[PDB]
Amino acid sequence: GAIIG
Amino acid sequence: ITGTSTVGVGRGVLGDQKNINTTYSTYYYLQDNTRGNGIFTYDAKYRTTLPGSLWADADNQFFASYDAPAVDAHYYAGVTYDYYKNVHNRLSYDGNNAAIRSSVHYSQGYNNAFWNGSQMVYGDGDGQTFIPLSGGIDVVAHELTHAVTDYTAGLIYQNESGAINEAISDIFGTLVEFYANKNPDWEIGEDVYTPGISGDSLRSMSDPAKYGDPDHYSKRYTGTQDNGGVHINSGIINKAAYLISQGGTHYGVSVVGIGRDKLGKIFYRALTQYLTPTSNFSQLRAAAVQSATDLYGSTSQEVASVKQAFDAVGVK
Ligand SMILES: [Ca+2]
Numbered sequence: 388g389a390i391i392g
Numbered sequence: 393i394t395g396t397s398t399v400g401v402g403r404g405v406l407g408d409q410k411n412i413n414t415t416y417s418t419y420y421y422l423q424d425n426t427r428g429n430g431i432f433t434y435d436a437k438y439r440t441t442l443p444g445s446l447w448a449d450a451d452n453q454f455f456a457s458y459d460a461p462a463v464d465a466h467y468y469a470g471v472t473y474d475y476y477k478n479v480h481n482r483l484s485y486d487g488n489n490a491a492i493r494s495s496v497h498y499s500q501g502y503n504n505a506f507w508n509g510s511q512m513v514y515g516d517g518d519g520q521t522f523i524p525l526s527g528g529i530d531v532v533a534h535e536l537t538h539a540v541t542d543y544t545a546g547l548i549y550q551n552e553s554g555a556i557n558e559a560i561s562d563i564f565g566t567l568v569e570f571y572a573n574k575n576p577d578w579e580i581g582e583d584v585y586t587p588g589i590s591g592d593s594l595r596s597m598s599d600p601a602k603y604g605d606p607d608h609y610s611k612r613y614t615g616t617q618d619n620g621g622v623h624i625n626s627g628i629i630n631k632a633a634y635l636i637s638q639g640g641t642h643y644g645v646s647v648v649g650i651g652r653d654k655l656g657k658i659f660y661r662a663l664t665q666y667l668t669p670t671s672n673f674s675q676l677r678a679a680a681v682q683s684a685t686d687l688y689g690s691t692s693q694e695v696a697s698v699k700q701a702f703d704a705v706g707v708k
Contacts, residue, residue, distance in 0.1 A: 389506030389538065389561075390531050390581060391594055392618040 393417055393446065397425045402454025404464040405527030406583065412466050414452055422447035422466045427473045428489030433466040436495040436513075443495045443511055461496040461524035465514055468532035469494055475533070475568045476540070480660050485539035492536070496526055505531055507538035521586060528584040529572055534565030545667035552672040554622035559629035560663055562597060567656045578634055597634045600627030607631045608643060609673065609706035628705050629676065633659065635701040645704035648697045658683045658698065677702040 395417030403409050413424035413431070422433035423446065436444035447462050454463050469492050476482040483489045494512035502515025505525040512535050514526045525531050538561055541547055547557035562580050570576040575583070579593035586592055593603075600607045605627030612628060613621035635642060636658070639649025658680055665686075666679035680698045688694040702708070 388504045389535055390504055390525060392623045 393421060393423060395421070395423075398452060400449070400452035400454055402459055402463040404467065405460045405524045410463065410467050412454065412463060413470070414449075416452070419448035419450060420452040421449075422462055424466065424470055427470055427492075428484045429491045431466060431469045431473065431492045432494070433462050433469070434493065434495040435462065436498045438497050438500050440499050442498075442508070442513065443493055444497075458497075461514060461516060461526045464524075465494040465496050465512065465526035465532065468526065468529045469512070469536065471529060471572050472533045472536045472568050475564075475571045479567075479571065479656065482540070485536060486543045494526070496524065505535055507535040507542075509542065512536060517584065520588065522581075523584050523587050525581075525584050528581050529574070530562075530565040530569045530579075531581055531584060532565075533568030534561040534580070537561040537564040540564075541663065544664045545671065546669040547667060547671060548669050549619055549622060551620040551622075552625065553670055554619050555625035556629060556667070556671060556673070556676050558622045558626035559633065560659065562595065562626060562630050563633045563659055564656070566597060567652060570652055578638075595623070595627065595630070597627075597630035598638070600631055607705065628673065628707065632701040632705045632707065635704055636697055639697075642704040643706075645700060647700040647704055648693060650694050650697050654688075654694055657687055658694070661686060673707045677707050 395415040398414045398416045400412050400414040413426050414420045415423035424431040433447050434443040435447050496514045498513045498515050501518035503517050503521045505514040516524045541557055547553040578598040579596050581594035585594050596602045605624050606612050609628055613624045635647040637652045637655040639647050661683035662679040684694045684698045
């Protein structure tokens with residue numbers, strides 16, 4: 388997860 | 393792999409045709425030898441084992457539906473490499489031309505994409521929240537920017553340092569989208585988010601509050617979800633960056649805009665020369681002021697605008 392949580 | 397450099401053609405997630413740099417040895421592989429020590433794209437085959445298999449294709453044509461996320465992951469990694477090299481004189485994410493590896497088709501219906509400390513990883517989305525996430529140039533560049541951060545400031549991924557980490561990725565993801573100059577905007581993820589809903593995005597830098605994210609330090613999230621709000625409180629920094637570039641009046645504080653190129657120079661210098669693993673928002677303001685001072689002078693409009701923008705979002 389990284390572009391969003 | 394060892395082979396000869398070739399040029400294939402295919403279609404990306406959004407249906408656009410593009411050429412891709414490949415390597416031929418029995419098969420045509422998604423291996424671009426033209427950039428640094430290479431850009432390599434892999435098939436994770438709907439599993440979570442990484443990286444998976446280096447992408448092999450029999451005919452150098454990448455028009456199958458299954459090929460589309462790989463085409464875009466490979467091509468947009470190339471655009472992002474070009475941005476860092478041509479704009480910031482940075483050779484790949486480590487500054488020494490490290491190979492860039494990406495895997496697509498990660499897991500099943502996976503609604504995310506991430507840099508994992510070693511490589512990029514893209515889900516296909518579930519078809520409702522997301523289509524395959526490598527279709528968004530801002531997504532690709534956002535996550536590759538985490539690699540730049542890893543090798544430079546090293547901002548810890550929690551609380552304010554983590555929100556800065558996220559904002560740096562949104563900032564440079566957007567600047568890469570402007571560099572490529574196809575439908576550029578100050579939104580994040582609009583090209584791959586919610587195919588059934590037009591005009592939305594994951595986050596907005598120009599108005600973070602459109603999606604409930606704070607646009608002022610007095611509205612910051614202080615709880616423990618999302619690693620202490622790293623994708624929430626990033627809105628405070630994203631708004632400041634937007635104001636530095638574009639100008640405007642925000643909570644009654646006026647900011648003179650200085651444009652995207654100077655925004656990028658200031659934040660790249662802050663990231664690579666001043667920020668540290670534990671930098672907080674106040675320290676980011678100081679790092680940005682000092683970076684603008686180095687680049688443009690202490691009496692410059694650029695320094696004054698950095699101060700105005702952080703004032704406008706309540707960061708002293
Ligand atoms: Ca949408």
